[model samples]
Target chain A: MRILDYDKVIERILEFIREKGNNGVVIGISGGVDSATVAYLATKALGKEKVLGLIMPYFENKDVEDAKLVAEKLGIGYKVINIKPIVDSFVENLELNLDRKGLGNIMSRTRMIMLYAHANSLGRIVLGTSNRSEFLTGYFTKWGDGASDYAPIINLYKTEVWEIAKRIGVPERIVKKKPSAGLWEGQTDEDELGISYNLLDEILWRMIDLKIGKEEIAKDLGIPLSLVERVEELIKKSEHKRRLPIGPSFEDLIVG
Target chain B: MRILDYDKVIERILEFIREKGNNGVVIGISGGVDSATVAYLATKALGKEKVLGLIMPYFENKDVEDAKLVAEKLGIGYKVINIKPIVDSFVENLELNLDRKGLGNIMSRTRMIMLYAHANSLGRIVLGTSNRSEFLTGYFTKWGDGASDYAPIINLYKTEVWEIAKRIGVPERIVKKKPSAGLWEGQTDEDELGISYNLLDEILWRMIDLKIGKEEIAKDLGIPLSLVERVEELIKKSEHKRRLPIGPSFEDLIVG
Candidate 1:
């Protein structure tokens, strides 16, 4: 759980958004390579005019020009908003025809309510480009694109977020695309995660940062203990999309 | 975290939605009483023709006729859906003038995207009623109405969810009104939680089910160690709304 030290994750995402004073961040770029490796580390930790990169895109090729070529090569400030008429005004105002994973979860929670309405009207802070192989295989879209207020490449490892998106330069055609949260049309994330972010980051790095299990990660990567028990059944049915909408008491009971 | 019996929370919400087969449950009925005691325990554990209720009002009185009088006194199946033209088409397609807590979080994430677009097009399951004082003072709406697939009174204590909504009858005008997630317009959960869900459910039942501290819950409820340090600063700034969307590694690091 440690090895990623790109100047301690860009000085801890500029010391966790200037100790939560928050006047920066909005992310949702989606050219791929995990939101252009968190918009090249939040525009190298809050410089490019406090970073914005929204893009949103519901369609039309080359993912909105490789998401404005990774926000003009990290110059920052972006917008593009067009979640297919806000997911067709939410499937014609709730008549909900759905299909294709319920209209790709209302097109990823309508681009997570337009990136929390421009980070709730510019106080600015949504920046989550979910990694760790789509947050341990829930494969995104719980609170659509699995909501965030600050993610800083959520625990890396979509092949360590493609080697920190090539050590933070992040725009080789979005670090060589294929991963898609676009949700359809030539979809890929190794064809919906059947494995390959080089064997799902070595079976989630030996079953979660080397604690190792699931038959010693399919006998130490010789592979195929039913593909490390299908990536530990997609990290145990995505452990309720990694938590906090659960019930019963204040804690105990992750369903039942 | 115990005392909430009532037939083991309606046989564990009909054995956790018939062991996740999911064909019933939609909830979001905001006449309050924590979604009318979870749509009267998901229509007594999936009965009233396999429960539905949706309501989702954003303005205009009597909360969609007391959320269709708690879905016609639990005959179930309902729908209202008018999040003010879907929060005025997300502030006129993201021009966003937002204010009232950012347009009350785009009208609770557009009624959680019309209750997960009718539970992802009718296969159902999205029922959450969020209690334990809006899941420890987050006062709901992270993924708007804090998205859910199952939440039978998230650990009680909004006066133990008004005594399990009067032991499962859940009527008496939604258990004698005045709690409101209807957001703005005489908004009430004791005027937006400045305190008083009977002293914020006995200081969140002795600071979370008797783990008690915060000057022994203000000198054991003599109250006013600045109202138990403003309910422990709204449960430590909503502990990132109970949990998840945090970063760092698989765990560890709840910010910087």
Candidate 2:
């Protein structure tokens, strides 16, 4: 019986935007379920006139058309910015000697820069596109896709992202494709993560919402403990991304 | 009797360092109590041989000498890097037409990059130097000074930082100075925040740890309700900075 009501979510998003009193929201559309779902909801919430979809792709990116398709269908204003030159200039100017991971971070953060700038110029809030699966696992870069004025879809797991996206007019082609941060070429999120969304989402829900221990969940699902253990590790490692920077508390250090 | 035992804090820091298994920590020294306190603790925790202090100042910065004094006193390895050229180059490269606030953000993010780069190179952790007052009020730049591997002194109020700094052999000059983010020239944290730390710290403790309502807090302190209200406003406004990005929950959206 646990399920997201798409209509209710749209109402809430509309209300949140209205309460903030901003012109509208600006979102980065990646041709994925999460962004498409958010773009659709924002269009419904604030009207397509108010929403801006910024499509930022690296110089070499596939699915630019998919990203464009979502915006066109939603009837929102959209722009495609090439993040290649921006990222290259930053890396060169910053004198960074980076590997693929470092370059990926630069790309994401560069995208973050463009989004914030666009939002500020338009007096709009930046709506992040991450879902709960990525948020919980720290799959997104810190302060890159993870940073936003608000994230309308972050609380939903990937399957929930799929559910809502399907309910809302998201294109089938967009929904069916493999999820990638597109941080690098040939990077399938599932393959890189070593697990599929179905398993990860269930493990996450049972572990968090249902408050089941990893061991119990593993045994109940007839899965190896290592699966559960890896999820736990991801959760722990990404804890830093989930809260304010870690600091010693006054109470912990103080003695009466 | 509610006071931080500097020795106990040091032991905990040392234990934390050992557990993390990094070579040591790299801290940004600002010639202020927070950074000085963190530097002192890290030195005591991991020994002078293991600690590194990076004195990063803008070209036209005051107190670079003061920052150096702490490092010398602590016997820690330290380097002075002018953040001027780096920030300037970043601004140029990013093609940003930025005012002071925008420029300040770039500066912070740039420093974040440098510190992270240094930490990775040295196999060390980045130690953040912010205290409870700056944190609760959201005074520091988001993902700027706020981003770090660990914040050793985050829970302490400004007064607590002073108290701990004095006890831990941090130079009196560094300990007894007006706190400034030094993000911009002539910017004092108190002047900009429009409330002194003593008031802000107490208000934060009362509002958060004591769970006191603003009206009650105002009445209890004999301060104007507006003061309590402003404190409350700061708390609410900065809530985003304190946790993961805001997102609509699956449960909230879902109806059976």
Candidate 3:
């Protein structure tokens, strides 16, 4: 993949969403680097009033406060809704697990639902905060976080998200913390997957977009075989999450 | 589908395990009917000590107590692992929208990981608790809750499970509660699916097994058209959950 320029990219997103409809847009700000960047870009493109920020948190986290701060700093309209009860109600009452990919999906879907609710109420489009690292890795859950009204940062790699986050004046605390979906506590993306973001992007770049095998690419940035294999498996296993369902009329189209 | 004798079926399960060299069996108990039933059966077939009952709770629930009752009633060994930390960790870490399906999967995969860990520790086989109705609906998550080393009751209809539970002395508390995966609180299989097991089974028997069309089956069995159509979708979507990954490959020469 070609190296992405974060500034021009952000400008593109702002323009796309502004022209998307007659109304301004809303975004769920979790205080993480991704949303902060999206909020900043949206605000720049459409002004603070047009960029409504819904600070949603499940059970309280310092990140929620950070989200509020970002909204205030950016001069955007903000409101806080404790989604714990709604989320927990679903988890406890429905006996939902929310531990596997299902729960991951729930987090995305919940946010999407709220974003859309906000979208509908304000007649605004929902802004997505996902990055290329998550999208191509299939890290984000479909119909959840992956379901975006308009995703501006989905094409940027993880490194570029950091670059943009810093360039756009994101706080140091957020830039420093490991990336997470915030579905559960003390869970880091790297911790679960067992790979650093930089390393993961590099490996993925070589294997998927570049079509280089591990041995060939190991000269400059050697990664473990197991890690590479697991990455490969994760990417492959998540293929269904990435595409349209396999068509059923293959035989019909293949007749001699 | 032809009805199998419940007693004989359980006996076969016992034999199936015993014939496989006294392997330990692991099962995730959500304090729900399906898992509780599986726990009871495992205790019967493999004995109390041989069955490792992992009580994976998202938070404190009456179901965990119900699960505990199953282990206690059978005098089987059990472990209570609260999923709060893991759940919270994931929530805090992953950037997701949070929806129903995603939440369900996290619980499922988290439980599955725990199951596999226990299996690796005890050298056990992970038993599945999915009944034919849920199975037909493709109601379970693939490679998450829908996975197992061997399913003792994979073929049993929901009614047959009830009969088997009663015969094997499953407590009224568990047997009476609405069947659920215990992923979300207050979630019932019937309520979620919007159809009764009795109706579902009758429909499956007539349509899927007997190969009857919607109009014919509806008129013959007095079933509703909407119900028939919904169940049909379940049958189609869950096709992956029901079959092996193998297909008729023109490249049979790959093996040769």
What does DockQ give for each predicted structure?
Answer: 0.21, 0.43, 0.03
Provide backbone clash counts, one per model.
1, 3, 63
Clashing pairs in 2: A3-B254, A4-B254, A5-B253
* Cα DockQ of the candidate 1 complex: 0.21
User: What are the per-model C-alpha RMSD values against the true structure?
Assistant: 22.1, 3.6, 11.0
CA deviation > 4 Å runs, candidate 2: A1-22, A63-65, A69-97, A213-225, A250-256, B1-21, B55-59, B63-65, B68-99, B210-228, B252-256
Per residue, candidate 3 scores C-alpha lDDT tens digits across A1-256 of 2365444555555666667533888888988888888888788777887888888787487888888889989999877866655445445533323344444444555565566555655556666788767766778754455455567776667887787778777887887778887877776898877888888888787787679886766664655677777888888877755542221111121212
**After TM-score superposition, what is the CA distance of residue A177 in candidate 3 from its true location, in Å?**
31
Candidate 3: list runs displaced more than 4 Å.
Answer: A1-256, B243-256
Candidate 1, A44-123: lDDT as tens digits: 76688987888877778888898888888777778887778767877887785778777888788878888888787888
User: Of models 2 and 3, which has the larger DockQ?
Assistant: 2
Taken over the whole model, the C-alpha lDDT of each candidate is: 0.75, 0.77, 0.69
By DockQ rank, best first, the candidates go 2, 1, 3
User: Interface RMSD, all models, one decimal each?
Assistant: 13.8, 3.4, 15.2
Q: Which candidate comes out best when scored by lDDT?
A: 2
The CAPRI category of model 2 is: acceptable
Q: Chain A TM-scores, one per candidate?
A: 0.34, 0.92, 0.88
Instruction: Output the number of the DockQ-best candidate.
Output: 2
